[PDB]
Design an enzyme around this catalytic site. Structure first.
Site, PDB file in Angstrom:
ATOM      1  N   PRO B   9       0.836  -1.130   0.086  1.00 42.51           N
ATOM      2  CA  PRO B   9       0.035   0.152   0.091  1.00 42.51           C
ATOM      3  C   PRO B   9       0.930   1.307  -0.040  1.00 42.51           C
ATOM      4  O   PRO B   9       1.823   1.373   0.652  1.00 42.51           O
ATOM      5  CB  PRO B   9      -0.865  -0.013   1.156  1.00 42.51           C
ATOM      6  N   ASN B  10       0.246   2.353  -0.848  1.00 44.84           N
ATOM      7  CA  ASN B  10       0.925   3.620  -0.645  1.00 44.84           C
ATOM      8  C   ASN B  10       2.595   3.831  -1.137  1.00 44.84           C
ATOM      9  O   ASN B  10       3.036   4.926  -1.334  1.00 44.84           O
ATOM     10  CB  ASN B  10       0.915   4.248   0.733  1.00 44.84           C
ATOM     11  N   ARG B  17       5.437  11.508  -0.191  1.00 47.89           N
ATOM     12  CA  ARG B  17       5.546  10.861   1.522  1.00 47.89           C
ATOM     13  C   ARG B  17       6.604  11.665   1.971  1.00 47.89           C
ATOM     14  O   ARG B  17       7.248  12.321   1.276  1.00 47.89           O
ATOM     15  CB  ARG B  17       5.698   9.488   1.479  1.00 47.89           C
ATOM     16  N   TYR B  22      11.653   8.742   3.401  1.00 44.90           N
ATOM     17  CA  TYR B  22      11.413   8.230   1.719  1.00 44.90           C
ATOM     18  C   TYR B  22      12.591   8.779   0.726  1.00 44.90           C
ATOM     19  O   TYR B  22      12.282   8.463  -0.397  1.00 44.90           O
ATOM     20  CB  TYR B  22      10.164   8.054   1.532  1.00 44.90           C
ATOM     21  N   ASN B  76       7.679  -6.148  -0.696  1.00 43.18           N
ATOM     22  CA  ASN B  76       7.735  -4.943   0.172  1.00 43.18           C
ATOM     23  C   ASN B  76       6.172  -5.010   0.616  1.00 43.18           C
ATOM     24  O   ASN B  76       5.480  -4.105   0.245  1.00 43.18           O
ATOM     25  CB  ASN B  76       7.961  -3.627  -0.211  1.00 43.18           C
ATOM     26  N   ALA B  79       2.846  -1.480   5.095  1.00 48.37           N
ATOM     27  CA  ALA B  79       2.157  -1.361   6.317  1.00 48.37           C
ATOM     28  C   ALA B  79       1.379  -2.813   6.743  1.00 48.37           C
ATOM     29  O   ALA B  79       1.266  -2.928   7.905  1.00 48.37           O
ATOM     30  CB  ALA B  79       1.259  -0.110   6.200  1.00 48.37           C
ATOM     31  N   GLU B 100      11.912 -10.239   1.968  1.00 44.12           N
ATOM     32  CA  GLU B 100      11.222  -9.127   2.605  1.00 44.12           C
ATOM     33  C   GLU B 100      11.906  -7.722   2.308  1.00 44.12           C
ATOM     34  O   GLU B 100      13.057  -7.555   2.879  1.00 44.12           O
ATOM     35  CB  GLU B 100      10.598  -9.183   3.806  1.00 44.12           C
ATOM     36  N   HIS B 102      12.228  -3.360   3.047  1.00 46.77           N
ATOM     37  CA  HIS B 102      11.565  -2.140   3.452  1.00 46.77           C
ATOM     38  C   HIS B 102      12.761  -1.057   3.291  1.00 46.77           C
ATOM     39  O   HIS B 102      13.645  -1.244   3.424  1.00 46.77           O
ATOM     40  CB  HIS B 102      11.386  -2.247   5.052  1.00 46.77           C
ATOM     41  N   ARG B 109      10.834   3.240  13.724  1.00 39.35           N
ATOM     42  CA  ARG B 109       9.722   4.024  13.706  1.00 39.35           C
ATOM     43  C   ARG B 109       8.844   3.862  14.812  1.00 39.35           C
ATOM     44  O   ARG B 109       8.888   3.392  15.732  1.00 39.35           O
ATOM     45  CB  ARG B 109       9.039   3.532  12.300  1.00 39.35           C
TER      46      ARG B 109
END
Lengths: 158, 158
Positions: B9-10, B17, B22, B76, B79, B100, B102, B109
């Site tokens: 998502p996003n 962002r 980012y 990835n 969220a 995976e 990120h 975070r």
């Protein structure tokens, strides 16, 4: 371009450890793969290797890195990753890239290993690739340095 | 040797962002770096790219990977990494390497991002290298495949 490769507790005894988790490879064997990766790629990286079972020996080595000889650090703090605020704080004061490696996926072992104080302090974390994660660490560090220093000349010239 | 690159998502809206987290790079920009990494290295990897904001579209794509076309997946889950048991379960049933990635360090975070159900299901996790983590993912996958298949011929011949 000395990279310092710090390895934490019990990592010297790989190949007396559970081979279901850790395969059948030694710490020396890892460090050769790392040079063989460098030697091959043709990176002007000098690797230095330091293993220890003492938290304070880690913190000292990081602190000694603060002078000029080293440009980055690849560290596997081992089991200390999950408890050692001190090593985390050392990582925060280094003024140079630190990349955290774990052979195993620390998301998929005991609950006590999930959280890495130290990895939160590093730029980035790699985990679960076995010995290969150290070369991916090398890849990354080489890349990052090249970016940072490509960036310093691009501001002392403005 | 189709690698499937699933992005959650996003991630399509990178560069709307927080650039403190980012940087100032887009999803398309990432995917070019990835080909440019392949094209260069001279890996006979075909990359396929799939972004989506829906949990079930992820699970479908993983499930569709189960047939022969794909040899691995770099994902990835975004969220969803922290909530989606379902995507984790999909990853567990794929019969092929899943790595995976990120962009950010999910150790540094909000507390809600620390745990990755999905990353625990993958072979390995990379985090905090920005766009670079995807190429380190490629490096890894290429390496792993070469190991696994170098290993299959070394048991159908005994």
């Amino acid at each position: 371009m000395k990279i310092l490769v710090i390895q934490g507790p019990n990592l010297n005894m790989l190949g007396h450890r559970d081979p279901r988790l850790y395969g059948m490879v030694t710490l020396d064997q890892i460090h050769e793969i790392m040079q063989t990766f460098v030697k091959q790629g043709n990176l002007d990286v000098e690797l230095e290797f330091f293993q220890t079972n003492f938290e304070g020996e880690i913190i000292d080595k990081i602190q000694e890195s603060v002078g000029s000889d080293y440009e980055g650090i690849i560290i596997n703090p081992g089991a200390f990753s999950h408890t050692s605020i001190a090593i985390a704080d050392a990582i925060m004061l280094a003024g140079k890239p630190v990349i955290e490696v774990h052979l195993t996926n620390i998301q998929a072992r005991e609950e006590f290993r999930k959280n890495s104080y130290t990895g939160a302090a590093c730029g980035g974390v790699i985990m679960g690739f076995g010995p290969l994660g150290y070369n991916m660490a090398l890849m990354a560090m080489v890349n990052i340095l090249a970016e940072m220093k490509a960036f310093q000349e691009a501001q002392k010239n403005n």
